Design a binder for this molecule. Structure first.
Ligand code: FEC
Ligand code: FEC
Ligand code: FEC
Ligand SMILES: [Fe+3]
Ligand SMILES: [Fe+3]
Ligand SMILES: [Fe+3]
Ligand SMILES: [Fe+3]
Ligand SMILES: [Fe+3]
Ligand SMILES: [Fe+3]
Ligand SMILES: [Fe+3]
Ligand SMILES: [Fe+3]
Ligand SMILES: [Fe+3]
Ligand SMILES: [Fe+3]
Ligand SMILES: [Fe+3]
Ligand SMILES: [Fe+3]
Ligand SMILES: [Fe+3]
Ligand SMILES: [Fe+3]
Lengths: 170, 169, 170, 169, 170, 170, 170
């Protein structure tokens, strides 16, 4: 394809990827609010830390989309599921991360076909981080499924701090 | 009734939260534009303001959980894209002023529902919004009065907002 | 015997011992990969640490074999059992350490018969370390057998780090 | 589809892992020889390279577990003992070269099966095999070309690879 | 093809790449001398810093060529244009970096086609650094276009230092 | 062409089809023996019942080939894959059914082209049965994907009977 | 021999027997298609009923193979002869049945030598069914040789039903 058609096709999967990230951000932070309300601090904190990874992903995708002359989407892909119990949170997030890695592998392929090496390397790096999320969610989900109350009693009342407050303007 | 009182506060909390999610997306979209335009200091403060809005969304969600409600996941209204630099600051000042007006009405509902904790939350966040409003009005005025002289000063400045934020990986 | 005959009889028990160490390294690391996969950090780390003790044993035995003019074997003795469940890991590992100490104590006798004091001291030292492994495996097996999942639930999600990344060439 | 692709990756991962298991025993065997000869610098680097191959074996095993398979416990090929110094470095350079050629094909399978994580694993390890290859080529050339003054420099040098590794006792 | 033919084809793209780097070095340093003469310090400094990036690229390409048994070229590809006015400097440099990323992306495919993974990775990393250069040059060119002398008045008289004098023999 | 030419062209695709059914019988029964061995009764039973469907297809094809005066083949098309795990069983069986329907749709077009209405109807009815098979395999593969061990646990120990022992001679 | 050796030798003659059954299913069903085409119903019916007995034999051999940890063959033993005339069908099936019985009697011996009582009784029960097959084929063969068309005149146009359509998936 010509130069502008190669960018357009790459901007298209980047925006699909970014919409997935926007969904994950709202989805994982929703679960974080429940986990915190439930006073399972270690889980709440790690959920928030993974949501911040997705925020970074959404930001990196947008930055690349700008580099290529496109408009970064503001709409999330799909609907957020609320009110999930603990076992369902981890079941669903594992599936979600597994779906993301499959989709991004496909997007990576489109970048390689459009001769866009910089964008493909971006997906490569972010897919490796999605793998660390997936592994995390699969491990928690297994402990809940297999060990029940003794596992959660260990998490009950743990600290939920994710560190010093975010840099902001005020 | 107690339940009555909680439901009405949760409602204005979710309305406010929906406005914060809009602001996060709106402000980050402008940040992507300013960064792309290489107006680093402007891009950086826009993103820092967006992060304050993220904190507001989170504080609202946390209080909604304390009241037994469900924090909304949907933003209020639509994000405007492709705004020129003067439009960014003019419309953001407009939005901040509208947010303060709305939250001030939400606060009064909290007071009427006898919810002191939630009213204090609105009060603290309204003071942050005022800081945001003053910022946007100041930049708009510099762009108004000085034009390209002011742009020329921001052109090529650092865009860093500091250390990359805490993540899982 | 004569000198060469004495050395040859000692190189033979050293190579039998070394072959037992080569097996333990593969067996314990196989179980390590499983325990890690199950996300029992503390158990996974200690299994790997014991496998590293077995690596050192294999090396020490090889160095003595060279000192004696022999050739260090490269073949493991016996077959590695894969897919063992957690209680089965600890019961078979304790059995194996116990058998190891019995065999090394007979190898040690050979060294003494052949008037090889340095090699006998090497076996005595290593036998003491096998005892440490044995006691470790017996205790874990006992807690699993007596307390089951209430105990395992406390290992779940614990750190698995064995320390700083391995010195290597690259 | 998913399940066939996964199966094909586990197969090349175990083939690579079986090659690492071979490399570990082969290089440590040569290490014992170099040490017995009292060529300390050569002995130390041989063991250090063997520890990289251990790390490789381990990383392959971890990824195989991640994909649901069983890491192999058998080495690929026979280990050669009694090799003299020149043969050690000729043969090791040839092994590393074949390893790189085999892993480049394994990498291609991974790309073909859409496994990005496993493909990047092979990419990082191949870069380390290239460092091993260069090292053995260089040593082979000094041994071939610079004779006894080069061995006398190595004679009696330290063979230590650091502190004794983290163990259980 | 066979081992030899695969190496020769990769050495060929490596030397075409190196020749482009040698041209960039002379081209950007020529512009550096003009900018420094004009006393546009920050512009002169970053131009020399980018040239030093191209110097590192040429060296890395040469090292790989040696590794593959080839001879690193010493000839630059193309002619250096001299006496460029400031707008032409940033417009032509952006076009140049664009053309380099396109070319290198074709060279990368050859590497993969020749099954040369180490060399493909070299090209991938350098392409990311060319993308940083491209972004810089587009940004300066855009400020000159949008603000003109108002922007340069800001650069006039700034420090031109690239740091401490570079390591050498004397 | 002529009458015997038209029969010969039809007998040809009918034996290709028959060779595909013979393959399907051995392949699905192979999987049935695995599933039975695994004690996944309901899965084992339905796999055998689809295999009996394929036997009826093989028979119907043979009967038609005889009506057109040909000789029904006794050799299956392709190799039978053994040792398949459960996720692989359903994934490949779906692909296989999908390919059958594709193939039979082309065979049916030859029948219409050779003016053979009776055989075209035969292909039409069997393709509708293959679609039932395809839908079934897609459904199980979905449950195995999305629900994993929770779905297998429900199947574990279920009855494997396909009904009364088949009519035989003894 | 040891436990695994005994199982492997029994698995080997079980797979041999299974390969013979797979041959017998194809061979006899080929003859069935001929007998039905000729409109000799009772002959066609009984031939199919015997092939179904061989289907159940092949199934029982494979289930026992799975019990002993083996893999049931998917390959038939020998060539299937197609296009056979009626006098040739019955003479060949009788010779085939008598050879099967001689062969299974030897396989039975192996089982006894390998201490496999359950497998020996399986062969024993199937050999008694093969004997019923043999007698049937010998009797029809004799009527066709001794009475010819007078006997077949009785079979012409008889029902060929082997009962109700066997249960399947659709
Ligand atoms: C809370 C909360 C929400 C609201 C979600 C909800 O559903 O309530 C929330 C929402 C979002 C959303 C959308 C986006 C995506 C913006 C876009 O691309 O349009 C989004 C994007 C970002 N967030 Fe975000 N957030 N957010 C934090 C908390 C929340 N955040 C905390 C804490 C940190 C702290 C980071 C740190 O300290 O390093 C933080 C930082 C960032 C960065 C900064 C990245 C960097 O420089 O490394 C980016 C970009
Ligand atoms: C000695 C010796 C042998 C015997 C081989 C022979 O043929 O004689 C020996 C053999 C093996 C074999 C197999 C494996 C493969 C295990 C597997 O994947 O199943 C095998 C595996 C590992 N080794 Fe190993 N060894 N080994 C050391 C010495 C020896 N090692 C020393 C020393 C250290 C240094 C520890 C450190 O500093 O990290 C060390 C570290 C490791 C690590 C840890 C890497 C890490 O955490 O970064 C792993 C895994
Ligand atoms: C078991 C087994 C095998 C061996 C496969 C293996 O790899 O182990 C096996 C193999 C085959 C093979 C080939 C064919 C194809 C023969 C040909 O057309 O040449 C083949 C053909 C048929 N089978 Fe078959 N079988 N088979 C059963 C079990 C097995 N069968 C059971 C049970 C029933 C039960 C009958 C019922 O109730 O419908 C049954 C019925 C039939 C019918 C009868 C259909 C009808 O009249 O409705 C035909 C035709
Ligand atoms: Fe993400
Ligand atoms: Fe993720
Ligand atoms: Fe706000
Ligand atoms: Fe605000
Ligand atoms: Fe030991
Ligand atoms: Fe031990
Ligand atoms: Fe390696
Ligand atoms: Fe290597
Ligand atoms: Fe360059
Ligand atoms: Fe460049
Ligand atoms: Fe069919
Ligand atoms: Fe079918
Ligand atoms: Fe039979
Ligand atoms: Fe029979």
């Amino acid at each position: 394809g010509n130069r502008e058609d190669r960018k357009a096709k790459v901007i298209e999967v980047l925006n699909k990827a970014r919409a997935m990230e926007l969904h994950a951000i709202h989805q994982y932070m929703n679960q974080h609010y429940s986990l915190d309300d439930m006073d399972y601090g270690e889980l709440a904190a790690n959920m928030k830390l993974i949501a911040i990874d997705e925020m970074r992903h959404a930001e990196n995708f947008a930055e690349r989309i700008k580099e290529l002359g496109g408009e970064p989407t503001t709409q999330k892909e799909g609907k957020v599921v609320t009110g999930q119990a603990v076992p369902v949170i981890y079941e669903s997030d594992a599936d979600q991360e597994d779906a993301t890695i499959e989709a991004y592998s496909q997007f990576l392929k489109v970048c390689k076909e459009q001769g866009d090496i910089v964008t493909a390397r971006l997906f490569e790096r972010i897919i490796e981080e999605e793998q660390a999320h997936l592994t995390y969610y699969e491990n928690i989900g297994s402990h809940i499924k297999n060990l029940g109350d003794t596992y959660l009693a260990k998490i009950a009342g743990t600290p939920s701090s994710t560190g010093t407050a975010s840099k902001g303007f005020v």
